[PDB]
Ligand binder design. Structure first.
Ligand SMILES: NC(=O)c1ccc[n+]([C@@H]2O[C@H](COP(=O)([O-])OP(=O)(O)OC[C@H]3O[C@@H](n4cnc5c(N)ncnc54)[C@H](O)[C@@H]3O)[C@@H](O)[C@H]2O)c1
Ligand SMILES: NC(=O)c1ccc[n+]([C@@H]2O[C@H](COP(=O)([O-])OP(=O)(O)OC[C@H]3O[C@@H](n4cnc5c(N)ncnc54)[C@H](O)[C@@H]3O)[C@@H](O)[C@H]2O)c1
Ligand SMILES: NC(=O)c1ccc[n+]([C@@H]2O[C@H](COP(=O)([O-])OP(=O)(O)OC[C@H]3O[C@@H](n4cnc5c(N)ncnc54)[C@H](O)[C@@H]3O)[C@@H](O)[C@H]2O)c1
Ligand SMILES: NC(=O)c1ccc[n+]([C@@H]2O[C@H](COP(=O)([O-])OP(=O)(O)OC[C@H]3O[C@@H](n4cnc5c(N)ncnc54)[C@H](O)[C@@H]3O)[C@@H](O)[C@H]2O)c1
Lengths: 358, 358, 358, 358
């Protein structure tokens, strides 16, 4: 049973979803990537985009750009590891995409334009059974963070699911062991020192909706907002209105770090917390939550696919010496990598439960 | 008589041309900026963008944002030292712009989207008399570099003119005094090590016309094409087919350097060349061509309004010892600031020549 | 009566303390900078460093390099605006410095090698009557943040004064009015997102005492320690053991931002806190604390000489909506420029007190 | 029969040479690394430097740090792949290093300090049989570029050998096929847009020998000099007084590119030169000279061990269309990694020739 997926928007996350599908062994055997969609249908230019990444390197798979038939002027079929993917043209409305016809059942929505559960339904109107939004979703969609609440999915009810944001996926696992191990956050504020993204600008330009976010990106520390402010309360309803935060966008191109400051419900210590987070990383959060005892800096997490990886030393040293309630917890994440692995983990969970019931 | 100008595209070059008008003492008196055009009309946002620049800092003029009538919702008039500039909404076609209505005669075309003579003429159809494309132009518009061939301008024939590009305004001064002082160039190639611009990308992205241009801009040395390649031959026909070159877009926000390598027409020396450039700096090319004897790096050329500023020490330490024909000439330039100043000098030179005749 | 000073270690803080002295209009008239001490005595090189700064531009003063005698090989005296500062060679011990000879009474200890009280007394034995260390000090030196506790300085008891770090001169204003306006801080942790310094490395290199800190500076978010972790308790005895923090060094050359997360003593609001700080900013903290109501990023604080300028918007927008105990204060600072001005303002304060008593 | 080698200065080149020895299969069987030398004897700090590199990522090999006796305070032995390397304490004179005692015959000198052939013999007085200087040398040390002139090595008389610089290793292959294939280079001039290195400064600071080299590294285009200005004439004497160049140090942490403008000795075409370089890349320069047909940028050459990998499209698109003599040739290089592999290549060659005769 090849899960038939199509990628709408072959950008940073689209191309890293694609690469997490090939690197993890699933192309053409477990998941069938039927088609990819973006502005051009020049498969040679997509191959160029895949083969050479500034931040994550050359990939291990191989890519060819072949035509479907010599009647077409430019290569339109991509051939990865002998698997053929089709380069479909970008549609302004989700519904004008031929999903049903190409036989695509699960569509990964990663353009960034269709974050509303209502516009994303246009995929299903085009023929898709399910939709995963690689972002926070507005308008009613289900937001799941793997390792914390993927089980609340239901094939029957949830058809446009959302995998939250990179920072949610990092914060929430931290929050989830704090509650489940019962330290509890009474209240919590959080900062994500975060790499710049494709929504920012090389030099000072136009950004109407966030004035600061239009400042030259690679030469300014830019205050702005994070997506995990809302979404962690959505995933864990016990933190609704207990926790919020901001974002500082600094001049690195990938990897970010969460910096959570909370107050505990019961009296505890940072040694108890560090123990429970390591334990959790080895037992029930394994693969999603990780930890590190080394003096790592940010470029040591490029290509690290844990959702969140707790920094044991930066935490243990930077807390109040005899504290029972006021705690800092530092944790890292490759905002482009681990998040692209979680999208594929979610597709496959959903396909499993969709077959499990119908 | 105030020159009635309208800036279409209030971006890096739009806002720097504006500020140059204020810093030189022309607003309201010598130059009247009737209107500016961009993706919004919210003048409180153009205020912010004028008041805070990452590279060139805070401006000396004062900016206020007020509403034109109490009927409007967001402040839509700019007021720069008690002079009113209007914030007109952007139009997809130049012909649709109310230029004759607003009373604008000269339009500075700096959107980047209308570098063709004919899409630029839509301005004259919208009620403008003359257009200055802040870029090189296709379709056949007049290309004039100030200090070299601005005298070639005719009020009768040149309605869409072009002030070439930043690199062309840096290299043609140098090429000009080499041809005029009789050293001559037999053939020559050129390289601009240049700052990234707003067409480049924060993280690797789409740029289907120059594939390399699409790669993360601030973490890479990106080879690409320079404007001064086509344009130095248009300005000096003597260099047609004898001079071409490339760009290496490097991770700095502003200022670029030209690295000219040429073979001279007669047997000379680099000290003869160094003295002639210094001479031409102090005599005929003043304010256009400049020079330095100091050990400077790119940050020192921020806000240097010279088109070309020769580096006497880098040229001299990095040429062959007793050479008569093969030489290197190095020359800096603030690609944002000096080019903007030269646009204002062109507007003013055209507007005076037009009055002197009609 | 010119306050006889000499600067030991003319680097970033040494040249910004020097430009602060000249710019405020003090050189020659109120402060006589007798000598500057560094690894060289080539006043031509020192003058290359003064005239061109990558982050703070061309200074307002003029620097000339003169020979004291034609008997010396290279220029060894700096003539800044007609005034003569001598270039004395750098000694490995403060003690062997000719202070008593040169006439120097106040020494600004900005090498960063003699931060302990006792190696700092090495200047006094050698002739200086007073010493200001541009850094937190060990061995029991008096730590003073201007505008918070300079009233505690006594000419009799305190000869080796510490002006604390740049982050404590940013954090200590805000903790001072938070206690003075009785909100009070129960406990609190802080993070500074901070620009890389002279003590960091261009590529991965050696740093034996903090491992992460030797990593490539300009391409990593390097977690580390801050100086305000100790210093704010030395200055504000109330905060002894209630507040600590950490630093994240990010890829910008200058300007940083504190981000304090505290739990207040009483029940309050962020609009209450917002008013209390702004008020304080206009009244008793005017010149030390500042605020902004604008959407500014880090490069808008280059050359802002307030110790701490509070960002009203980023705070109000990024706090929990109806909270009474748990808050986040965000505040900027130009760690090179603001600090240096406090140095010149401590010399000036201490000096007159000494002249008041003896 | 292992070659016994010691590395003095375990910095960027020392650690990359170490990693090229383990990568190429050579550690413990073909080359035995008896000792590494740097500021510390802390095996743990060395292991942290080896395992986490910002640019070249995690090494494939495994590093442990053990104590050589129960008596030593801190781990002083590395155990890379079961092979034990000693951590010898850094010395001020090469001669005070225990090479004969340890049993070291070949010494990779890579501190950046002992670049004089006389200072370098200190190693042979310390007990070593040969010295390789990872940098151009003075005082008459024989200079070799692998792939161009290592056949000029005489076991007999060449004792302290210099492997030239990274730019001579890129430049000399190109210059070598142009003279061997009989295009010739009459006079030539080059420029290398180049990543910053460890001799540079994060923020503006001290640099007495090159004034510009002290300016903040990651925020300027810094003109400077190159090592291949001297060394290529020494490897290829045909080109002494005929070829020279300069350097621009830009904000990338690794990879650099050679922009070479030369005039041929005979009428030829850029198409012809392009074929010759590809041909050479495939036959006698293989593994040393490569080429690319792709639209690559600097980051695509990280971990590319060819010494000089020619850009076919950048060279072909940026030359004069009718030219027969005056050309531009562009070739890339990972200045840390390819040079490191070549140092191992020379040590290996040298050692086999020395065995062959004695
Ligand atoms: N960048 C990150 O680190 C990151 C992390 C987590 C989640 N995400 C989320 O994923 C989404 C996409 O982010 P990204 O960083 O990949 O951006 P991106 O711009 O690099 O990629 C988006 C791609 O969508 C394409 N596209 C736009 N409109 C399209 C359309 N109508 N039809 C087809 N293709 C279209 C664009 O050309 C682009 O290639 C965003 O919602 C973002 O929040 C990004
Ligand atoms: N920045 C430089 O280094 C530089 C130097 C020399 C010449 N130029 C030339 O100037 C032109 C603009 O360059 P820039 O660097 O200012 O870019 P920019 O993107 O900062 O500015 C262009 C502005 O035009 C606006 N715009 C887009 N469409 C518009 C429309 N239809 N109507 C009105 N406004 C519109 C954009 O929002 C933007 O603010 C380019 O063609 C470039 O070649 C730029
Ligand atoms: N840069 C900042 O943001 C900042 C802010 C606040 C305080 N400081 C502090 O000020 C001190 C200097 O820091 P910096 O950033 O200016 O560093 P820097 O390295 O630029 O300045 C140090 C200067 O001292 C010189 N020097 C070294 N040894 C000397 C000696 N023995 N005698 C005389 N001069 C000597 C160096 O050549 C250099 O010019 C440090 O203690 C630092 O903590 C720096
Ligand atoms: N990195 C490049 O791009 C490159 C390319 C070609 C050649 N090289 C040459 O390599 C040499 C070293 O440069 P690098 O880039 O490795 O710099 P680096 O500063 O990273 O390495 C030098 C190492 O030597 C150590 N060291 C200093 N003094 C020592 C001493 N007295 N004894 C023993 N070890 C000592 C330092 O701790 C440092 O780790 C230079 O001569 C350079 O020109 C570098």
């Amino acid at each position: 049973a090849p899960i038939k997926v199509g990628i709408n928007g072959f950008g940073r996350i689209g191309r890293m979803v694609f690469q997490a599908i090939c690197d993890q062994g699933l192309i053409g055997t477990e998941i069938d990537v039927v088609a990819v969609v973006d502005m051009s249908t020049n498969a040679e230019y997509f191959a160029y985009q895949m083969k050479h990444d500034t931040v994550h390197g050359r990939p291990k798979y191989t890519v060819e750009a072949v035509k479907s038939s010599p009647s077409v002027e430019t290569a339109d079929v991509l051939v990865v590891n002998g698997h053929r993917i089709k380069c479909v043209k970008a549609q302004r409305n989700p519904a004008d995409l031929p999903w049903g016809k190409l036989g695509v059942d699960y569509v990964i929505e990663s353009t960034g334009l269709f974050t509303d559960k209502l516009k994303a339904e246009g995929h299903i109107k085009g023929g898709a059974k399910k939709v995963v939004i690689s972002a926070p979703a507005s308008g009613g969609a289900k937001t799941i963070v793997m390792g914390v609440n993927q089980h609340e999915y239901s094939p029957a009810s949830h058809h446009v699911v959302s995998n939250a944001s990179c920072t949610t996926n990092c914060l929430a696992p931290i929050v989830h062991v704090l509650t489940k191990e019962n330290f509890g956050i009474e209240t919590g504020l959080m900062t994500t020192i975060h790499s710049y993204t494709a929504t920012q600008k090389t030099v000072d330009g136009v950004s109407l909706k966030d004035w600061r976010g239009g400042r030259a990106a690679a030469v300014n520390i830019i205050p702005s907002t994070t997506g995990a402010a809302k979404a962690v309360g959505m995933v864990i309803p016990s933190t609704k209105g207990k926790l919020t935060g901001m974002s500082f966008r600094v001049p690195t191109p990938d990897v970010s770090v969460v910096d959570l400051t909370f107050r505990a419900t019961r009296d505890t210590s940072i040694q108890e917390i560090d123990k429970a987070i390591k334990k959790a990383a080895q037992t029930y959060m394994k693969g999603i939550l990780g930890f590190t005892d080394e003096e790592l800096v940010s470029a040591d997490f490029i290509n690290d696919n844990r959702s969140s990886v707790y920094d044991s030393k930066a935490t243990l040293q930077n807390n109040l010496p005899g504290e029972k309630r006021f705690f800092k917890v530092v944790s890292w994440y490759d905002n482009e990598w681990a998040y692209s692995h979680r999208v594929v983990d979610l597709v496959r969970y959903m396909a499993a439960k969709d077959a499990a019931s119908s």
